[PDB]
Enzyme design. Structure first.
Site, PDB file in Angstrom:
ATOM      1  N   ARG A   1    -104.921 103.936  75.380  1.00  0.00           N
ATOM      2  CA  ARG A   1    -104.407 102.895  74.366  1.00  0.00           C
ATOM      3  C   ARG A   1    -104.776 101.559  74.659  1.00  0.00           C
ATOM      4  O   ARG A   1    -104.444 100.807  75.518  1.00  0.00           O
ATOM      5  CB  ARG A   1    -102.937 102.937  74.174  1.00  0.00           C
TER       6      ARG A   1
ATOM      7  N   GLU B   1     -97.099 102.450  62.698  1.00  0.00           N
ATOM      8  CA  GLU B   1     -96.112 101.698  63.084  1.00  0.00           C
ATOM      9  C   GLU B   1     -95.958 100.381  62.550  1.00  0.00           C
ATOM     10  O   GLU B   1     -95.186  99.564  63.118  1.00  0.00           O
ATOM     11  CB  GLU B   1     -96.078 101.582  64.707  1.00  0.00           C
TER      12      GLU B   1
ATOM     13  N   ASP C   1     -92.182  99.889  66.790  1.00  0.00           N
ATOM     14  CA  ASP C   1     -92.663  98.894  66.317  1.00  0.00           C
ATOM     15  C   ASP C   1     -92.182  98.945  64.708  1.00  0.00           C
ATOM     16  O   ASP C   1     -92.212  98.057  64.188  1.00  0.00           O
ATOM     17  CB  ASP C   1     -94.161  98.978  66.629  1.00  0.00           C
TER      18      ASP C   1
ATOM     19  N   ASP D   1     -89.621  98.243  76.272  1.00  0.00           N
ATOM     20  CA  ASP D   1     -90.886  97.775  76.263  1.00  0.00           C
ATOM     21  C   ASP D   1     -91.022  96.820  75.059  1.00  0.00           C
ATOM     22  O   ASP D   1     -89.796  96.380  74.520  1.00  0.00           O
ATOM     23  CB  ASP D   1     -92.069  98.775  76.163  1.00  0.00           C
TER      24      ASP D   1
HETATM   25  O1  LIG Z   1     -93.823 101.460  72.414  1.00  0.00           O
HETATM   26  C1  LIG Z   1     -94.318 102.495  73.071  1.00  0.00           C
HETATM   27  O2  LIG Z   1     -95.600 102.719  72.503  1.00  0.00           O
HETATM   28  C2  LIG Z   1     -94.061 102.922  74.544  1.00  0.00           C
HETATM   29  C3  LIG Z   1     -94.866 103.479  75.585  1.00  0.00           C
HETATM   30  N1  LIG Z   1     -94.257 103.915  76.732  1.00  0.00           N
HETATM   31  C4  LIG Z   1     -92.591 103.813  76.667  1.00  0.00           C
HETATM   32  C5  LIG Z   1     -91.682 103.927  77.613  1.00  0.00           C
HETATM   33  C6  LIG Z   1     -90.135 103.508  76.972  1.00  0.00           C
HETATM   34  C7  LIG Z   1     -90.190 102.780  75.541  1.00  0.00           C
HETATM   35  C8  LIG Z   1     -91.289 102.746  74.645  1.00  0.00           C
HETATM   36  C9  LIG Z   1     -92.799 102.960  75.052  1.00  0.00           C
HETATM   37 MG   LIG Z   2     -95.816 100.590  69.163  1.00  0.00          MG
END
Ligand SMILES: O=C(O)c1c[nH]c2ccccc12
Ligand SMILES: [Mg+2]
Ligand SMILES: [Mg+2]
Length: 709
Positions: free
Chosen positions: A325, A418, A446, A617
């Site tokens: 990503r 998102e 998001d 995150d």
């Molecule tokens: O928000 C994302 O795309 C996330 C990728 N790895 C995670 C681990 C805990 C919470 C959100 C995400």
């Molecule tokens: Mg996201």
């Protein structure tokens, strides 16, 4: 100033060196041509990148003012969105043409694991999470209750172990039924005339569907393991009476292994903190070690050998098929700056560098090539707003392929749905990438942050916990699956759903997350290998291919439903409810930010106000900070409330840590992490689409600057 000049670009030395010394060798790409390509792509595409970002701001500005000049008239609102080009015409039906894609993406429904690429140990475990121990996953989590006798301790608890065993035996009965009797009563397994025979106390039986017998290992007369398949996913029964667990088992079974994380996404975006060239290179290097197959902390798995029912030999993939990503269109990074000192767009850089690096995964690595055997590179592109932004990404990939000397359309795209402007224009977004798209996925986190920001001026939003059940999000989820299936995703591309964030609540995950495959998603996101193994259970219970076929042709969400703003209703909350939301959001924000800013950790388990361990995150941060910004904007809370809560929760976060950790209290106005958190809230309304990176990056960079002196 340790930079390297190439055309209009000034590349940080640590990056230039990495690319030349580590990334380029073995790709047959002339280094000088590569860099000339970088310069050319950046110069050509930067203007359109900026124009897109400006359009975001202009659209938000119009919407903001519309709300200020305002029992919201949805007809007028929709007409307005159309007028300003936010809501665009829906294209005619089409079917995607994406080709050369691996079976793990086109055909296999199963969990998709996302991991921070900066953490080599995590990344390795993830690549290796294609196969995972069901026993370990049950024993080690709360799926098996720690009732009396079954609690975990320093040593193996046979009561708990027996429960684990019984849980697995039932899974087998449910997934791969015997013609007669239960796996619970199995005393042995053999292969006779190409047929799996299961010994029961009183007789022997075969599978109700002999087609589910995929192979075995060891002698046919007493295999060391038996391999089954169900809904395209493999299940392996390890047979070892000499083992600790085996000696106690009625059939000498040592473990049950599940094909779990079919694909994994190595994340450069929301789960990592990378604010300069040094950070990026650490990430790029791990990505490289994964693709060359030599990343080591522990190492990457090789393929698995089996004997077919008939007696011949075959192999199965031992590794999770890897996506990478990239970051989205918004941010610049000073890993490269132009002549004028302007930072270069990070997304453009990611496409070039992760793309270059991905070439290694297409070729043998003295050992077979580690990744795509069909010749594809799989890139997830997050946070796009609308079809023009998708078309831009595709053009970027097209240009990068030219620089990389790769066939056009080698770089496949997983599209995150998102952002609101993508949701309401989803069909056009897919169309824009009709020959590259390998998945769409509802990044609901998001999406929720964008929901709040877009309608910031409309009024106070419902509490964060209320969002998951709001009409707009339920429509968004269905709408995504509809658009996917209508674009012919079945048998061609993944329809994916979002992340489970409660890492300790595995019992909860197992009972709840089955809703995603039931909704027709061929994949959904998990935070860990353990979680991947447990989520795999759902795909054995749900026949996603069937569900998808049954959903075909349905239009289950209207534009009006998608557009339903989650406004709170007058007097929705008592004072204590308001304080709890504030305190909870402040603690979650402070918990995440302190480690982001102080230690460069982009994903942290932060216990919430109810002491639930939540994996935080940037997306979860965007929600929390935007909600508080919205509440402050509309008078639900005062500036004294925000400050008092930040000050109150801070010492608690300090105590939740107390490692290489620095306290924020008592000198808040001197704590960069504290000030970052504060800023995220007090400046939330003015952040582009409520994105957290500008503040986080600036503050992390400030912390680093301060720490080096
Ligand atoms: O928000 C994302 O795309 C996330 C990728 N790895 C995670 C681990 C805990 C919470 C959100 C995400
Ligand atoms: Mg996201
Ligand atoms: Mg304004």
């Amino acid at each position: 100033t340790d930079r390297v000049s190439v055309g209009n670009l000034r590349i940080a030395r640590v990056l230039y060196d990495f690319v030349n010394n580590e990334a380029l060798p073995g790709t047959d790409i002339d280094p000088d041509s590569f860099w000339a390509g970088v310069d050319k792509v950046v110069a050509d595409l930067t203007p359109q990148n900026q124009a897109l970002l400006n359009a975001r701001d202009e659209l938000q500005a119009q919407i903001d003012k519309w709300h200020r000049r305002r029992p919201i008239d949805m007809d007028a609102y929709r007409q307005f969105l159309t007028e300003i080009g936010y809501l665009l015409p829906e294209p005619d039906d089409f079917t995607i043409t994406t080709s050369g894609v691996d079976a793990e993406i086109t055909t296999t429904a199963g969990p998709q694991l996302v991991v921070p690429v900066l953490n080599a140990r995590f990344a390795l475990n993830a690549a290796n999470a294609r196969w995972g121990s069901l026993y370990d996953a049950l024993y080690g989590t709360d799926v098996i209750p720690e009732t009396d006798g079954a609690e975990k301790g320093p040593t193996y608890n046979k009561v708990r172990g027996d429960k684990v065993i019984a849980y697995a035996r039932k899974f087998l009965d449910d997934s791969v039924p015997l013609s007669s009797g239960s796996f619970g009563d199995a005393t042995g397994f053999t292969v006779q005339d190409g047929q799996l025979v299961v010994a029961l106390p009183d007789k022997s039986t075969g599978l109700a569907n002999p087609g589910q017998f995929a192979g075995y290992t060891g002698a046919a007369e007493s295999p060391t393991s038996v391999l089954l398949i169900n809904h395209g996913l493999h299940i392996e029964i390890l047979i070892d009476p000499e083992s600790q667990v085996g000696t106690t088992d009625r059939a000498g079974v040592k473990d049950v292994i599940l094909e779990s994380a079919i694909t994994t996404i190595m994340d450069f975006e929301d789960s990592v903190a990378a604010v300069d060239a040094a950070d990026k290179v650490l990430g790029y290097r791990n990505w490289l070690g994964l693709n060359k197959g030599d990343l080591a902390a522990r190492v990457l798995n090789r393929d698995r050998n089996y004997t077919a029912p008939g007696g011949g030999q075959f192999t199965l993939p031992g590794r999770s098929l890897m996506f990478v990503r990239n970051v989205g269109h918004l941010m610049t990074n000073d890993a490269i700056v132009d002549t004028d000192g302007s930072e270069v767009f990070e997304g453009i850089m990611d496409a070039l560098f992760t793309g270059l690096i991905a070439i290694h995964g297409l070729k043998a690595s003295d050992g077979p090539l580690i990744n795509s055997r069909t010749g594809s590179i799989y890139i997830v592109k997050p946070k796009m707003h609308g079809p023009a932004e998708v078309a831009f990404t595709c053009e970027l990939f097209s240009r990068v392929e030219d620089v990389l000397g790769l066939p056009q359309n080698t770089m496949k795209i997983g599209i995150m749905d998102e952002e609101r402007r993508t949701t309401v224009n989803l069909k056009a977004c897919i169309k824009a990438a009709a020959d590259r798209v390998v998945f769409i996925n509802t990044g609901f986190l998001d999406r929720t942050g964008d929901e709040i920001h877009t309608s910031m001026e409309a009024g106070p939003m419902v509490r964060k916990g209320t969002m998951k059940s709001q009409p707009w999000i339920l429509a968004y989820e269905d709408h995504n699956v509809d658009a996917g299936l209508a674009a012919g995703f079945s048998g061609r591309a993944q329809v994916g759903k979002g992340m489970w964030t409660m890492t300790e609540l595995m019992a909860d995950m197992v009972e709840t997350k089955i809703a995603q495959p039931r909704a027709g998603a061929s994949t959904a996101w998990v935070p860990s290998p353990t979680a991947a193994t447990l989520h795999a259970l759902h795909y054995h219970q749900v026949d996603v291919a069937a569900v998808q076929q049954g959903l075909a042709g349905k239009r289950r969400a209207t534009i009006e439903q998608l557009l339903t703003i989650p406004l709170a209703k007058e007097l929705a909350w008592a004072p204590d409810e308001i304080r709890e939301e504030v305190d909870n959001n402040c603690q979650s924000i402070l918990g995440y930010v302190v480690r982001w800013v102080d230690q460069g950790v982009g994903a942290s388990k932060v216990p919430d106000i109810h002491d639930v361990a939540l994996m935080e995150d940037r997306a979860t941060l965007r929600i929390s900070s935007q909600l508080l910004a919205n509440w402050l904007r509309h008078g639900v809370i005062t500036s004294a409330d925000v400050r008092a809560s930040l000050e109150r929760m801070a010492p608690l976060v300090d105590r939740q840590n107390a490692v290489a950790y620095r306290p924020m209290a008592p000198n808040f106005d001197d704590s960069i992490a504290f000030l970052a958190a504060q800023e995220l809230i007090l400046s939330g309304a003015q952040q582009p689409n409520g994105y957290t990176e500008p503040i986080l990056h600036r503050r992390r960079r400030e912390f680093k600057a301060r720490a080096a002196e």
